[PDB]
Amino acid sequence: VNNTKKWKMEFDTRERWENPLMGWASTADPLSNLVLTFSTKEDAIAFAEKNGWSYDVEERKVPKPKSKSYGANFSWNKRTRVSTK
Amino acid sequence: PFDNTTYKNLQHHDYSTYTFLDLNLDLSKFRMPQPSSGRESPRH
Prior knowledge:
The structure is cut from a larger assembly and holds chains A and B. By secondary structure, chain A is of the alpha+beta class.
């Protein structure tokens, strides 16, 4: 999960087309590889507003806390018995 | 008379392949009713 720690700013992907000579991916987008790293959401929003970029923000999706019990694998009367191990 | 010279466990010379399971079938009538988990299996 170490790649889910920081905020990122990317841009909308523009056209990539086939190079007629070699088949390479040609682009005319200068911002196609620009990925910026931010510690918080507000730093990224301030940097986008400072540069006149129209932005959209997705909230951080954290995994919710799970209830883990190894003994639940071997319950007396619940469906959470494992059939194998 | 006290005997300490013969091996008294000579019954297992006459055990067949279904001796254990026929003994379990004989013992099935002596036993208490089993407890229930309330469902037919953990996949029910």
